[PDB]
Amino acid sequence: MNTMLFSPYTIRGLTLKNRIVMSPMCMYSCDTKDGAVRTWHKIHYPARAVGQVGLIIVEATGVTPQGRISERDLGIWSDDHIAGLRELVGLVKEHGAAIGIQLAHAGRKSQVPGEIIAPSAVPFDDSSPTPKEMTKADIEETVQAFQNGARRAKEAGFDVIEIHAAHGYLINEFLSPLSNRRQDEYGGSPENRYRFLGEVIDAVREVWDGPLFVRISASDYHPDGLTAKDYVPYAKRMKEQGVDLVDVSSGAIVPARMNVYPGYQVPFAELIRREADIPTGAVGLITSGWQAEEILQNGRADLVFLGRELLRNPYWPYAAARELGAKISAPVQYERGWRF
Amino acid sequence: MNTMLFSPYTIRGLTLKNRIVMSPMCMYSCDTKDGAVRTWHKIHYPARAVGQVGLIIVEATGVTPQGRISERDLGIWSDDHIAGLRELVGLVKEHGAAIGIQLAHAGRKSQVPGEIIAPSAVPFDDSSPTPKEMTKADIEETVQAFQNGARRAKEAGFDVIEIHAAHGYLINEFLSPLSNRRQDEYGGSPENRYRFLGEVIDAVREVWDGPLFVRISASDYHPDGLTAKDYVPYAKRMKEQGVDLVDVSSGAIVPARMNVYPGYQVPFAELIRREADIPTGAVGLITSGWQAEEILQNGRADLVFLGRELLRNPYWPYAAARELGAKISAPVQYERGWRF
Amino acid sequence: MNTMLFSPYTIRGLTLKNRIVMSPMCMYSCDTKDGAVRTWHKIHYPARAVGQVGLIIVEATGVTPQGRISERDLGIWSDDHIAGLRELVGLVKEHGAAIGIQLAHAGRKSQVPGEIIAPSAVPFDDSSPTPKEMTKADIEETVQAFQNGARRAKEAGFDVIEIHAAHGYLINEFLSPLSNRRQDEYGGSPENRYRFLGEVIDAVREVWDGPLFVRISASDYHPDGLTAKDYVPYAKRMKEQGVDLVDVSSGAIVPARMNVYPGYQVPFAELIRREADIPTGAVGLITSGWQAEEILQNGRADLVFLGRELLRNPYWPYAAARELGAKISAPVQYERGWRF
Amino acid sequence: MNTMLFSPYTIRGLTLKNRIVMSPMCMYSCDTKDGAVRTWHKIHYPARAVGQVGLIIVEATGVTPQGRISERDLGIWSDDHIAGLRELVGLVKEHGAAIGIQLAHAGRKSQVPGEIIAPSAVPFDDSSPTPKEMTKADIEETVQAFQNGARRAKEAGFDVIEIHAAHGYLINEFLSPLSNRRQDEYGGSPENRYRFLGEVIDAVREVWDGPLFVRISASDYHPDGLTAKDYVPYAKRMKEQGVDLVDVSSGAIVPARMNVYPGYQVPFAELIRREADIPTGAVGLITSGWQAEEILQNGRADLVFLGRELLRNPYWPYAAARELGAKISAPVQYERGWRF
Ligand SMILES: Cc1cc2nc3c(=O)[nH]c(=O)nc-3n(C[C@H](O)[C@H](O)[C@H](O)COP(=O)(O)O)c2cc1C
Ligand SMILES: Cc1cc2nc3c(=O)[nH]c(=O)nc-3n(C[C@H](O)[C@H](O)[C@H](O)COP(=O)(O)O)c2cc1C
Ligand SMILES: Cc1cc2nc3c(=O)[nH]c(=O)nc-3n(C[C@H](O)[C@H](O)[C@H](O)COP(=O)(O)O)c2cc1C
Ligand SMILES: Cc1cc2nc3c(=O)[nH]c(=O)nc-3n(C[C@H](O)[C@H](O)[C@H](O)COP(=O)(O)O)c2cc1C
């Protein structure tokens, strides 16, 4: 049974052995609170690589200390992070899986003690601290921080880099009018609201020419917020800037009610894919190979991102292969076990 | 867990208790070869009604003897067929399931001994008898047969009627230029090739004002045949004539290779749905409630047609309800067994 | 994958195509309240035959009106019941499934309005009417009713007969000292409490030489009641009298707490099987083919009785066959659907 | 839903959080060929600990170099192995799982280049090297090797120790007449054939008073070989010697045909359990919580050992808990994922 799910996919120079991607998920397991890779990560990620996941994307990694979501996040603001990250990379690549990292900045949604920054001094909600309005210098510092991150990620041996522009974090906050009330050239206009992201992408492409992903929130789920069609122009923009694939998520810019169901974000992925003629990754309640195969075969997305499902079963690819009657390469150690 | 799969759907004033539809499937179980409903059908269909299927479409029923696919098909060319059909109707509606029937004519794909008819004297393949080219009288005679069938179906107490215009059968043969080489008013142009279907729809609507489906073959899978885009104008046409929902299938006008996979015909259904602005039914390798829910929630179709799965498990709705964590009314006899 | 679950089993000369048995389950669907077979039964049972169940035991059928559990039960106290039962027999055997019937008498647990009878004038609980203490004439009259029932069952064309001596009903009430306080030849000792059952078996065998099952309640779940060990001598007794297989259930002689779990009654079945050297049927939360195969291969039982599972899925045998990678004959109509 | 599967079990002073045990499975992943713990093991085992397995038993670890099955086996013949083992122990215990190790000696089935030892100079088969007949000194050396192993295992922080007396390896070879043709006090008699094992157990108990398991092969599957009843006396013996639980497997003493099916070795486990009044572990095609729960509830074994299933899904406990409606403690990191 020849399937698309387990067919190779080539981005730039990198060739993934299948279409299965481990969606970036924070583990909050940096007990040392210095952003260092810990034992938990060294067991957590390689498990999925053994599980035959084609691409494993490391959780949101703060490019600055105040850029972290929490004090237990992975970091990459120092050359000291390279060693631990390099070790992690080796542990993953070892099993035939490609490894990526999600460069992130939590913006006004950072729960790190102290000052937090954002496009405008507007709180996420009435329970969150008011962020500092970023100055011009702040913006350029942060852009430089992202570039430094990409540099270290490449240094560590990462195959793919993703820019976290979603889930209501810093970049997302520049994108949405809900959070961006600036009146300089970084706000008050679709083009202006895109500027920050545009700079981040340029800065990264300046030190990184390998696969580049950008994760977006296709919708704010708010009458005065962004919708999928607002991200078509942005996607075409990202394509022009050398972005290889758009990881299409949604929401979290502000507290909002969201109807959730199997593949509730797939239409966002197909929309961007077809309207902007750019590869996309589908994420959101993808739990079966049957479902993943339909997503791929019907051209709704090129890569399938799994979140919670890969937390429940690190070897999901095996079960999916069984479900689809496909055959994959089991680790020699598990040959007799993965066998029918 | 509030789901769309197990939400009611009203069509023309008929309320289906859910979105699950039993796709019309030939049983070839008329041992008497007279098109009469037999014990098999009386056990086969009601079983799915007990299974809590919302709508059960009875297999292809020949409006004329030579219109049957085989001599073991159900027939409706005689008022004598009513009694048996009415009994079947009661057996099904008894459990809260709506019942439909598929009015059919095999055309050049008929395997019943004797003369077979078609738009043009062109055989389906080198293993099929060459059909007689239909005269005007033949065409009007067949249109009348479709009306007689609808009339009898109404008297039997059917809730829904579907016109079989797909799978390369008679009507499909008029629609496709691959099989229709006529140079009169019934061929040579889009509206001419549609004429036969249009007349059938009108003839039926003259005696039937209930929910009316039309099953189409969205693609001929042939370079010189029809594709989805060809059926958008047709679907709009059908909407104007009072067609309530398009049951979107594909293929079988000529021998052709099909790439089959989960939901391989869903895009056809959504295409027609959104471009023709008409309710559609998705069919083709729909096997899980998870999959079915995605199709509905994402507006790809309004009803989900199940074929093979409903032959494997007549109580599929129960399994799907469990899968989705939905709650449905079990038959009072099975309450202690269906108890989650 | 050669399995024991889907291996034939011959009992007295009757060959069952597999080891799957539909456990007798009351449907309370005799709306006419005359014990007549109704449309429900004619759809309910044959569905499992199409499902490829090897043996289908019809629900508890009252040998006398007051012997019914409720007025909506099947009856067999009249020659008028034969016609309907014979029709049901044909509907089932039509698909290669053997059909059995459970001859029953509710005793003090009868809920039909009027006088109810029992070994002693002791109510099931404080919510049940106190039974009339049976006279010798009553006992012989009831034994004759069981024979009449067997005679009619034979004429209807049944393949297997099961005597309901379990679930705290009439016969069970004679067996258990909790309900049998008689001081005549029918109580006061092990063989005396067995006497009624022994007579019923003899009466039945006088008109029936086919496969004969006896359903027992292996345990009363009461400090002063019977336990499995008490039924070993009884099972040996039954073997001597020509009983072919013991269907081993438990409980319900009085209100009692039961610890229920997968195969919670299997040990009872294996106990009887190995100590009395007699074929047994295992029943009670048997839900998977995996589980069923273990029961058979490990010699815990010879037949597997399914209850609730067969109400949830009439085609369970198909699912179980897939689970075990076994091959079974699909109904010719469903061949393309059951295709693995 | 309160289950036995996820109920604590206490051995000596150790308390397992559930009845789920990871059966010892060779990984052949010691690339350095020095028996050292490698990166593979450090990822392999902790994964199951994260998966909420209650007891994880490390693969067969050779107590001597020639005692290894292969050159890629884990070893424990040197104090140098302690460091790596201690690290492994920490990585496992970290997640609430108890960790054990299987002390092993491959005997005549060793595939290590060079001399191999056995009770008698008889080959496993015509494709295997002829083993050296062990002298008295050889036997005492090997017994001392086992004691040294236990010492180091305790030193490393292991919770449980298992002695590998099965699968036709050294100890098993002393047990079975098929392989043991000695005429000294170590052969020619059930008592004599047990002597080697008896000494090994004593030697271990001399430096270890924590939980002690012994894995046996209940049957040789050969007319002239051992059967389950031969191991009853041995089990009672092991109980007398302070053995806490008998891990009941079977076969592999010589090439033999073996009928395999769900729980094909459970009867061996129950036999030893009830006849010798000693806790046992059941292993062999246990793949579902439903099945595991029946094994526990019916007193067939006290602990459930999973092999291949735990290779296919390291987080099996989660799926089993779901299957049984039980609730367990998910790692905080996976809380949102293991959640319904
Ligand atoms: C525990 C957890 C942590 C997450 N952290 C991240 C993250 O760091 N970066 C990100 O892009 N998405 C994050 N998300 C979202 C997931 O990556 C995923 O896209 C989302 O949960 C939906 O995917 P799923 O339905 O397959 O779980 C997280 C989700 C979960 C449950
Ligand atoms: C045995 C069988 C008979 C069928 N007969 C008909 C038919 O009479 N009319 C029709 O429109 N489709 C017929 N089909 C196609 C089914 O309606 C259904 O669309 C097709 O099998 C694919 O759906 P599925 O993947 O859910 O099985 C038949 C299919 C099968 C397997
Ligand atoms: C609705 C229902 C009706 C039943 N009626 C009978 C009956 O008439 N005779 C009988 O022996 N057992 C009867 N039982 C018990 C079943 O035969 C079966 O042994 C029990 O439900 C447990 O089996 P299971 O776990 O496979 O469902 C009935 C059970 C149910 C759920
Ligand atoms: C790859 C593999 C390695 C094994 N190595 C060992 C071992 O080192 N020690 C042992 O006692 N059993 C070993 N066995 C047997 C397993 O521990 C297990 O008891 C057997 O495979 C049956 O269990 P299962 O059906 O759950 O897989 C091994 C089995 C497999 C498949």
Flag if B262 and A287 touch (Cβ within 8 Å). Answer: no
Interface residues of B toward C, Cβ cutoff 8 Å, are 27-29, 39-40, 42-44, 46-47, 50, 91, 94, 307-315, 318-319, 333-334, 336-338
* B167 known member of a binding site: yes
Name residue D33's amino acid.
K
Q: Would you report the helix, strand and coil content of chain D in percent, each value rounded to 5?
A: 35, 15, 45
* Cβ B26 under 6 angstroms from ligand 2: yes
Pair C308, C302: CB distance under 8 Å: no
> 3-state class of B182 per DSSP?
coil
Q: Where are the alpha helices (DSSP H) in B52-135?
A: 81-93
Phi, psi of C274 (to 5 degrees): -85, -30
User: Chain C contacts of B42, Cβ < 8 Å?
Assistant: 43
The DSSP annotation for B247-262 comes to: EEE---SS-------T
Q: Which of C211, C281, C195 is nearest to C246 (CA)?
A: C281
User: What is the rounded distance in angstroms from the CA atom of residue C331 to the CA atom of residue D272?
Assistant: 45
* Cβ B23 under 6 angstroms from ligand 2: yes
Pair D69, D109: CB distance under 8 Å: yes
Q: Which residues contact B122 (CB under 8 A, 6 or more apart)?
A: B108, B130, B131, B179, B181
User: What is the rounded distance in angstroms from the CA atom of residue C309 to the CA atom of residue C287?
Assistant: 6
Range of the domain at D249: 1-340
Q: Tell which one of C26, C48, C73, C74 to mutate to probe ligand 3, the residue whose CB is within 8 A of the most ligand atoms.
A: C26
Tokens representing residue D246 in the block: 């008998």
* Cβ A27 under 6 angstroms from ligand 1: no
For the CA of A252, the nearest ligand:
1
Phi-psi region of A119 (alpha: psi -120 to 50; beta: other; left: phi over 0): alpha
> 3-state class of C297 per DSSP?
helix
Pair A87, A130: CB distance under 8 Å: no
Task: Enumerate residues preceding breaks in chain B (C to N > 2.5 Å).
Answer: none
* Cβ C308 under 6 angstroms from ligand 3: yes
Beta pairing, strands D14-16 & D9-11: antiparallel
Q: Which of B264, B283, B287, B267 is nearest to B275 (CA)?
A: B267
Q: Which of D211, D284, D45, D315 is nearest to D292 (CA)?
A: D284
Tokens representing residue C313 in the block: 């899925």
Q: Which of A208, A85, A77 is nearest to A141 (CA)?
A: A77
Tokens representing residue D196 in the block: 């080697």
> 3-state class of D101 per DSSP?
strand
User: What is the rounded distance in angstroms from the CA atom of residue B105 to the CA atom of residue B145?
Assistant: 10
Instruction: Return the CA Rg of chain B.
Output: 19
Pair B253, B216: CB distance under 8 Å: no
Q: Which of B167, B52, B22, B41 is nearest to B105 (CA)?
A: B167
Nearest by CB to residue A337, choosing from D39, D308, D333, is D308
Flag if D294 and C263 touch (Cβ within 8 Å). Answer: yes
Flag if A312 and D337 touch (Cβ within 8 Å). Answer: yes
Cα Dmax for chain C: 64
Residue that is written with structure tokens 């996309």 in the block: A280
Residue D240: Cβ within 10 Å count: 12
Q: Which of A25, A134, A101, A99 is nearest to A69 (CA)?
A: A25
Number of domains in chain B: 1
Beta pairing, strands B55-62 & B98-104: parallel
Phi, psi of A272 (to 5 degrees): -60, -45
User: What is the rounded distance in angstroms from the CA atom of residue C69 to the CA atom of residue C71?
Assistant: 7
Phi, psi of D298 (to 5 degrees): -90, 10
Residue C91: closest C-alpha in chain B: B39
Flag if B267 and A298 touch (Cβ within 8 Å). Answer: yes
Q: Which of C47, C8, C9 is nearest to C27 (CA)?
A: C47
Chains that touch C (3 or more CB pairs under 8 A): B, D
Nearest by CB to residue A315, choosing from D29, D39, D312, is D312
* Cβ B307 under 6 angstroms from ligand 2: yes
Handedness of CA A30, A31, A33, A36 (dihedral sign): negative
Flag if C312 and B307 touch (Cβ within 8 Å). Answer: no
Cα(D24) to centroid(ligand 4), Å = 6
Q: Shortest Cα distance from B314 to chain C (angstroms)?
A: 7
Q: Which of C111, C131, C110 is nearest to C181 (CA)?
A: C131
Pair D30, D72: CB distance under 8 Å: yes
User: What is the rounded distance in angstroms from the CA atom of residue C107 to the CA atom of residue C119?
Assistant: 8
Q: Is B65 exposed, middle or buried (0-12, 13-18, 19+ CB in 10 A)?
A: middle
Flag if B294 and A267 touch (Cβ within 8 Å). Answer: no
For the CA of C69, the nearest ligand:
3
* Cβ D339 under 6 angstroms from ligand 1: no
Pair C12, C211: CB distance under 8 Å: yes
Handedness of CA C204, C205, C207, C211 (dihedral sign): positive
The DSSP annotation for C9-75 comes to: EEETTEEESSSEEE--------TTSSS---HHHHHHHHHHHHTT-SEEEEEEEESSGGGSSSTTSEE
Q: Which of B7, B26, B25, B27 is nearest to B17 (CA)?
A: B7
Strand partners, D215: D164, D247
**Atom number of ligand 4 nearest to Cα D265:** 22
* Cβ A22 under 6 angstroms from ligand 1: no
Query: Residue B166 to residues B131, B197, B249: CA-CA distances in angstroms?
Result: 18, 11, 7
Residue that is written with structure tokens 């806490």 in the block: D244
For the CA of B336, the nearest ligand:
3
User: What is the rounded distance in angstroms from the CA atom of residue D239 to the CA atom of residue D278?
Assistant: 7
For the CA of C312, the nearest ligand:
3
Flag if D288 and C290 touch (Cβ within 8 Å). Answer: yes
* Cβ C24 under 6 angstroms from ligand 3: yes
Cα(B324) to centroid(ligand 3), Å = 27
Indicate which residue's Cα is closest to atom 2 of ligand 4. Answer: D25
The DSSP annotation for B145-173 comes to: HHHHHHHHHHHHT-SEEEEEE-TT-HHHH
Residue B268: closest C-alpha in chain A: A298
Flag if C333 and B46 touch (Cβ within 8 Å). Answer: no
Residue C340: Cβ within 10 Å count: 9
Q: Is D241 exposed, middle or buried (0-12, 13-18, 19+ CB in 10 A)?
A: middle
Phi, psi of A118 (to 5 degrees): -165, 170
Q: Which of B85, B89, B94 is nearest to B61 (CA)?
A: B85
> 3-state class of B217 per DSSP?
strand
Phi-psi region of B239 (alpha: psi -120 to 50; beta: other; left: phi over 0): alpha
Q: Which of C156, C173, C172 is nearest to C164 (CA)?
A: C172
Tokens representing residue C2 in the block: 């050669």
Query: Residue B234 to residues B237, B241, B243, B321: CA-CA distances in angstroms?
Result: 5, 11, 11, 36
Q: Which of C285, C296, C292, C294 is nearest to C249 (CA)?
A: C285
Tell me, what DSSP letter sits at residue B134? P
Q: Which of D208, D117, D118, D215 is nearest to D163 (CA)?
A: D215
CATH code for position C304: 3.20.20.70
Tokens representing residue C90 in the block: 């044909």
- Cα angle at B307 between B303 and B311, to 5 degrees? 130
User: What is the rounded distance in angstroms from the CA atom of residue A240 to the CA atom of residue A234?
Assistant: 10
Chains that touch B (3 or more CB pairs under 8 A): A, C
Indicate which residue's Cα is closest to atom 21 of ligand 1. Answer: A307
Pair D243, D210: CB distance under 8 Å: no
Pair D257, D250: CB distance under 8 Å: no
Nearest by CB to residue A336, choosing from D39, D94, D308, is D308
Q: Shortest Cα distance from C221 to chain D (angstroms)?
A: 16
The DSSP annotation for D119-159 comes to: SSS--SSTTSPPPEEP-HHHHHHHHHHHHHHHHHHHHHT-S
Q: Tell which one of D20, D25, D161 to mutate to probe ligand 4, the residue whose CB is within 8 A of the most ligand atoms.
A: D25
Residue that is written with structure tokens 């004038």 in the block: C121
Nearest by CB to residue A311, choosing from D39, D44, D334, is D334
Query: Residue C339 to residues B184, B233, C83: CA-CA distances in angstroms?
Result: 45, 38, 37
